[PDB]
Amino acid sequence: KMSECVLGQSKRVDFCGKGYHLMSFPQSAPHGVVFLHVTYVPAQEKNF
Amino acid sequence: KMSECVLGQSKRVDFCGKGYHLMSFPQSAPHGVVFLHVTYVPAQEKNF
Ligand SMILES: *[C@@H]1O[C@H](CO)[C@@H](O[C@@H]2O[C@H](CO)[C@@H](O)[C@H](O)[C@H]2NC(C)=O)[C@H](O)[C@H]1NC(C)=O
């Protein structure tokens, strides 16, 4: 995920958050890593 | 695979069946899952 979510834009479904992946930012944690995932989500549909 | 083969279209080779991935349908099995992989296979080539 560090390579595919932070150093790129992934198309893999539900791999870099929920929605359409735009970008991610890492944060360190005591014995691990926290990813902040920024996604695009559509809203307010109409029928045509 | 449930995320990437069923909830979307994958470009990963051989991850969602043999051929060019179109779509997949899940089925429940006892203690497991069965994937029905729908693929696109070209046929009847000519040379040019
Ligand atoms: C396209 O042309 C090639 C030859 O350039 C065909 O390959 C030949 O196929 C025949 C019959 O199977 C063999 O006897 C030859 O040995 C093959 N040639 C070579 C050099 O391998 C090929 O069959 C053609 N493709 C189509 C779809 O007709």
XYZ file of C-alpha atoms and ligand atoms in Angstrom:
124
model
C 0.000 0.000 0.000
C 2.838 2.459 0.571
C 3.867 2.097 -3.088
C 0.431 1.720 -4.616
C -1.613 4.153 -2.507
C 0.880 6.906 -1.653
C 3.327 6.826 -4.583
C 0.584 6.245 -7.131
C -3.119 6.209 -7.946
C -4.691 2.777 -7.696
C -7.691 1.402 -9.564
C -7.922 -1.690 -7.347
C -11.358 -1.821 -5.728
C -11.415 -1.266 -1.946
C -7.632 -1.301 -1.715
C -6.957 2.374 -0.982
C -10.166 3.278 0.820
C -13.812 3.409 -0.176
C -14.682 5.445 -3.251
C -12.507 6.353 -6.202
C -8.901 6.695 -5.102
C -7.419 10.160 -5.413
C -4.490 10.275 -2.975
C -3.145 9.011 0.340
C -0.854 10.395 3.063
C 1.146 8.295 5.559
C 1.416 8.891 9.296
C 3.694 6.986 11.640
C 2.376 5.064 14.645
C 4.235 3.347 17.513
C 4.456 -0.143 15.964
C 2.862 0.471 12.619
C 1.636 2.876 10.025
C -1.595 4.808 9.537
C -2.771 5.702 6.039
C -5.041 8.668 5.337
C -6.993 7.790 2.196
C -8.699 10.525 0.155
C -11.409 9.260 -2.186
C -13.948 10.638 -4.638
C -17.574 9.712 -3.941
C -20.454 10.674 -6.266
C -23.627 12.184 -4.854
C -27.096 13.433 -5.758
C -28.132 11.342 -8.763
C -31.096 11.980 -11.047
C -32.729 9.681 -13.562
C -32.635 10.395 -17.288
C -11.222 -11.156 -5.401
C -14.707 -10.325 -4.154
C -13.777 -6.655 -4.322
C -11.738 -6.703 -7.497
C -13.512 -9.326 -9.621
C -17.128 -8.879 -8.591
C -17.409 -5.212 -7.597
C -15.311 -4.032 -10.519
C -13.370 -4.866 -13.646
C -9.759 -5.954 -13.228
C -6.806 -5.663 -15.572
C -4.708 -8.066 -13.466
C -3.660 -11.029 -15.624
C -5.126 -14.371 -14.538
C -6.532 -12.894 -11.338
C -10.132 -13.148 -12.498
C -10.055 -16.191 -14.802
C -8.428 -17.055 -18.145
C -8.942 -14.530 -20.925
C -9.932 -10.907 -20.825
C -12.011 -10.218 -17.741
C -15.541 -9.011 -18.358
C -17.453 -9.842 -15.176
C -17.844 -12.361 -12.355
C -20.757 -13.781 -10.324
C -20.370 -15.225 -6.800
C -21.965 -18.415 -5.525
C -21.985 -19.713 -1.964
C -20.384 -23.049 -1.165
C -20.081 -24.786 2.237
C -17.110 -23.150 4.016
C -16.086 -21.461 0.795
C -16.844 -19.333 -2.213
C -17.167 -20.128 -5.911
C -16.479 -17.499 -8.565
C -18.036 -17.726 -12.013
C -15.557 -15.878 -14.228
C -16.802 -14.425 -17.529
C -13.988 -13.731 -19.988
C -13.462 -12.508 -23.552
C -11.474 -14.870 -25.780
C -10.541 -13.959 -29.386
C -10.934 -16.560 -32.122
C -10.272 -17.273 -35.809
C -7.260 -15.156 -36.660
C -6.083 -14.168 -40.125
C -2.625 -12.932 -41.058
C -1.969 -9.564 -42.697
C -0.366 -17.245 -41.253
O 0.737 -17.536 -42.108
C 1.665 -18.427 -41.491
C 2.895 -18.575 -42.378
O 3.529 -17.300 -42.532
C 0.995 -19.776 -41.256
O 1.901 -20.647 -40.570
C 2.030 -21.865 -41.324
O 0.994 -22.799 -41.025
C 1.044 -23.939 -41.880
C -0.172 -24.819 -41.626
O -0.423 -24.894 -40.217
C 2.337 -24.706 -41.627
O 2.421 -25.811 -42.534
C 3.552 -23.804 -41.807
O 4.725 -24.486 -41.346
C 3.384 -22.500 -41.037
N 4.449 -21.579 -41.385
C 5.421 -21.283 -40.526
C 6.574 -20.510 -41.092
O 5.376 -21.618 -39.353
C -0.278 -19.618 -40.433
O -0.997 -20.856 -40.424
C -1.165 -18.519 -41.005
N -2.264 -18.246 -40.098
C -3.529 -18.424 -40.465
C -4.563 -18.000 -39.465
O -3.831 -18.901 -41.548
